Amino acid sequence: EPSPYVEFDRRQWRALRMSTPLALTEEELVGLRGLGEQIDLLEVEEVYLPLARLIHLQVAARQRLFAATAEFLGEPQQNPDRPVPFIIGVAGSVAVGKSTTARVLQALLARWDHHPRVDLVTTDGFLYPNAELQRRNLMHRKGFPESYNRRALMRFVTSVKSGSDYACAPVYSHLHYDIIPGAEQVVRHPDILILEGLNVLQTGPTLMVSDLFDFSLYVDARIEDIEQWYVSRFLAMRTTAFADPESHFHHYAAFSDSQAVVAAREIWRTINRPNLVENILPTRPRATLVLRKDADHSINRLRLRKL
Amino acid sequence: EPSPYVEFDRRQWRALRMSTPLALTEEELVGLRGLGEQIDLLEVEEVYLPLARLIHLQVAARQRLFAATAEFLGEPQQNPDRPVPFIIGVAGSVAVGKSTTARVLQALLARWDHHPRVDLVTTDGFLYPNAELQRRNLMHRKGFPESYNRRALMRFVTSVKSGSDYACAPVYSHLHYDIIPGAEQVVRHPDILILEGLNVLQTGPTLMVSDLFDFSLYVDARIEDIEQWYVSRFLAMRTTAFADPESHFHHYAAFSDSQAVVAAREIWRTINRPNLVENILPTRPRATLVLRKDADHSINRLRLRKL
Numbered sequence: 001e002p003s004p005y006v007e008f009d010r011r012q013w014r015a016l017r018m019s020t021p022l023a024l025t026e027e028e029l030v031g032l033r034g035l036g037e038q039i040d041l042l043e044v045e046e047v048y049l050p051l052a053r054l055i056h057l058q059v060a061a062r063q064r065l066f067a068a069t070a071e072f073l074g075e076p077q078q079n080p081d082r083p084v085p086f087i088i089g090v091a092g093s094v095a096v097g098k099s100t101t102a103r104v105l106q107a108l109l110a111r112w113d114h115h116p117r118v119d120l121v122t123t124d125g126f127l128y129p130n131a132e133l134q135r136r137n138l139m140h141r142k143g144f145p146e147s148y149n150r151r152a153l154m155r156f157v158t159s160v161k162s163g164s165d166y167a168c169a170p171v172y173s174h175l176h177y178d179i180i181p182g183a184e185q186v187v188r189h190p191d192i193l194i195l196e197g198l199n200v201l202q203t204g205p206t207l208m209v210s211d212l213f214d215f216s217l218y219v220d221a222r223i224e225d226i227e228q229w230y231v232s233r234f235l236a237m238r239t240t241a242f243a244d245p246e247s248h249f250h251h252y253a254a255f256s257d258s259q260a261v262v263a264a265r266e267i268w269r270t271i272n273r274p275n276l277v278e279n280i281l282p283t284r285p286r287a288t289l290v291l292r293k294d295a296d297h298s299i300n301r302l303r304l305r306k307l
Numbered sequence: 308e309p310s311p312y313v314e315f316d317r318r319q320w321r322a323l324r325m326s327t328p329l330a331l332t333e334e335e336l337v338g339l340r341g342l343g344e345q346i347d348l349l350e351v352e353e354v355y356l357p358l359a360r361l362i363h364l365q366v367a368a369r370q371r372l373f374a375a376t377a378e379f380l381g382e383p384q385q386n387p388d389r390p391v392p393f394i395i396g397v398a399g400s401v402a403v404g405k406s407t408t409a410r411v412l413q414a415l416l417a418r419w420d421h422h423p424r425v426d427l428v429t430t431d432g433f434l435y436p437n438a439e440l441q442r443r444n445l446m447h448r449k450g451f452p453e454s455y456n457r458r459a460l461m462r463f464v465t466s467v468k469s470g471s472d473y474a475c476a477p478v479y480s481h482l483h484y485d486i487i488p489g490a491e492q493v494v495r496h497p498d499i500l501i502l503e504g505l506n507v508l509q510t511g512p513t514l515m516v517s518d519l520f521d522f523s524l525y526v527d528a529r530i531e532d533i534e535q536w537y538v539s540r541f542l543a544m545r546t547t548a549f550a551d552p553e554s555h556f557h558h559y560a561a562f563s564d565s566q567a568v569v570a571a572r573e574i575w576r577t578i579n580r581p582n583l584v585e586n587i588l589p590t591r592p593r594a595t596l597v598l599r600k601d602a603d604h605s606i607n608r609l610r611l612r613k614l
C-alpha cells in the first residue's frame with residue numbers, strides 16, 4: 001500500500017547528513033537543553049543535521065512557490081534582502097521536548113552561511129491572561145485550544161509571513177504562571193520563524209496558523225513515557241523553579257516525593273493527558289516530520305511526509 | 308491588516324491572462340456546460356485563462372518541492388516521463404457549477420503544449436452503495452462526509468500522487484442514483500489530477516485528500532442563489548433526466564411547477580443546505596482560489612491565497 005510517509009531508523013536517517021557541518025559546542029548545546037532532556041552532540045549529528053539539511057533544501061524550493069504567484073501577478077521580483085519568511089511549526093505534548101528541539105533547530109539554522117535571522121516564538125504568550133481565563137472558567141484548561149487568543153496568534157504569524165517590518169507577540173511568565181504586563185517580543189522580518197506550541201498543528205473552520213507553515217515538526221513519544229517525564233520533572237522542580245519564593249508553585253517545593261507524585265499525576269490526568277489525546281495527537285498525521293523518542297528521550301525513529 | 312488573501316474583480320483578474328491562448332470552441336465549451344450554467348467563451352477568456360496560467364506557473368514551481376526532498380534523500384532524479392502528479396481540488400455546493408468549472412479547467416490544461424494527461428475524477432463514485440447507506444441510516448445524507456468511503460478515496464488519490472501506474476475508482480450512476488456494479492474509472496499516472504467534490508477540501512484527525520492538493524478551487528455563490536439554481540434545475544430536469552423511465556426520479560417528471568418547487572425546496576432544506584452550511588462552507592477559507600458567482604451565474608469576483 002503506497003504511503004504519503006516514509007519512515008526511518010536512526011541508522012538510515014544519519015546517512016542523510018552528508019557534509020552538513022556541526023557548528024555547536026557542548027557548552028552551547030547545554031544552554032539549549034531543558035531540564036530532563038538528554039540531548040548530546042551525537043544526537044545533534046545523527047538527527048538534527050540531516051534535518052537542518054532537508055529544511056535548507058526546501059527553503060529555496062519554497063521561495064520558488066511564492067515567486068510563481070508573484071510572476072503570475074505581474075508583480076516586481078522581490079528583493080532577497082527580504083524574501084518570504086519560512087515558517088516552521090514544532091508541536092507535541094507538554095514535557096516532550098518541543099522547547100529543546102526548537103531551540104536547537106534555531107541555533108543550527110542561524111549558523112548557516114549568511115547568518116539568516118532565525119526567530120523563535122512560543123504560543124505561551126498567546127494564552128489569555130489568568131484573569132481572562134478565570135472569566136471563561138478555563139483556569140484548568142491552560143493548553144487547550146480555547147485557552148489561546150488564536151485570533152491574535154494568527155494575526156501575528158500572518159503579519160510576519162506577509163512581509164511586515166516587525167510584529168509583536170505578548171510574553172508569558174512561567175515564574176508567575178501568567179502573561180507579563182507590557183511585555184512584548186518583537187520580530188523584524190526574520191528569514192525563518194519557528195513557532196513552538198502544543199496546538200500549532202491544529203486545523204479548523206478558519207484559516208489557521210498551521211496553514212501558514214512551510215515545514216513542521218511533531219516531537220512524539222509513548223504516552224506513558226511522557227507522563228513519566230512529566231512527573232519526574234515535576235519532582236525535580238521542587239529545587240529549581242519551585243524553590244523560588246516568587247514562584248506561583250512555591251508551595252510544591254515542600255511536597256514529599258510521594259505527595260509530589262500524587263499532585264503531578266492529577267494534573268497530568270486532568271489536564272495535559274486529555275489535551276494530548278483530544279487535541280495534539282490528532283494533529284500528528286499532518287506533521288512534515290515526526291521525531292519519535294524512546295523512554296530514554298532518545299530519538300530513534302522518524303516518519304517523513306514525502307507527500 | 309495584512310491578509311493571506313488578495314481579491315479581485317473581473318476587470319483586474321482578466322489582465323493576468325497575457326498571451327495565454329484560447330484553444331476552445333463554442334461547440335466544445337457547450338459539451339462541457341451543465342444544465343443551467345451560463346458560461347461562454349468570454350468568461351473562459353477573462354477568468355479561466357488567467358487561472359490556467361497561474362496553475363502552469365505553479366506546476367513547475369511545485370515539482371521543485373518534491374525534488375528538494377528527493378535530492379535530500381539521495382534518491383535518483385525522477386524521469387519527466389513520470390513526474391509527481393499535480394493534484395487539484397474543486398469544491399463547492401450542489402448546483403454551484405463545480406462540474407462545469409472542473410470540466411472546462413481540464414479541457415484547457417490538456418490543451419497545453421506537450422498535451423499533458425489531465426484526468427478528472429468526481430467523488431461521486433466514492434459514495435457508499437445505497438444498500439450500505441440504508442444499512443447506516445444515511446440514505447438522506449448523501450453528500451455528507453459520512454456518506455463517503457473516505458478511506459478508499461484517500462487510498463485512490465494517494466496511490467496516484469505516489470506514482471502508481473494506474474489506480475481504480477468506482478463509478479456512480481446519476482440515472483440510477485447509485486454505484487454501478489463492476490464499473491471502474493482507471494487513471495494511469497496522469498500529469499494532472501482534478502478531484503471534484505462537495506467534501507474534497509475537508510480536514511480532520513487523519514491525513515486527508517485535501518492534504519494532497521497542490522492547488523484548489525472553491526466555486527462560491529450566495530446561498531439563496533444556489534437554492535434558486537438548485538430548484539430551477541430540479542424543475543428543468545422533468546423533461547431531461549427525469550423524463551427517462553429508467554430514472555430513479557422518473558416520478559418527479561409529472562410534478563407541476565408548484566409541486567416540483569415544493570419537493571425541490573424540501574430536499575434543499577433537509578439535505579443540501581445543512582451540508583453546505585455545516586461541512587462545505589467551513590472549508591472555503593483553505594481554497595487556493597475562490598470563484599464568486601453572481602445570481603446570474605457569472606464569476607465577477609475572486610479571492611486568491613497568496614499565503
Ligand SMILES: Nc1ncnc2c1ncn2[C@@H]1O[C@H](COP(=O)(O)OP(=O)(O)O)[C@@H](O)[C@H]1O
Binds near residue numbers: 034035092094095100
Ligand atoms: N512550572 C514551570 N516553571 C518554570 N519553568 C517551567 C515550568 N514548567 C515548564 N517549564 C519549562 O518551560 C518549558 C515548558 O515545556 P513544556 O511546556 O513542558 O513543553 P516541552 O517540554 O516539550 O518544551 C520547558 O523549558 C520547561 O522546562
Ligand SMILES: Nc1ncnc2c1ncn2[C@@H]1O[C@H](COP(=O)(O)OP(=O)(O)O)[C@@H](O)[C@H]1O
Binds near residue numbers: 481482548556
Ligand atoms: N438527478 C440527476 N440526474 C441526472 N443528472 C444530474 C442529477 N443531478 C445532478 N445531475 C448532473 O450531474 C452533475 C451534478 O452536479 P451537482 O452534483 O449539482 O454539482 P455541480 O452542479 O456544482 O457540478 C451536474 O452535471 C448535474 O447537472
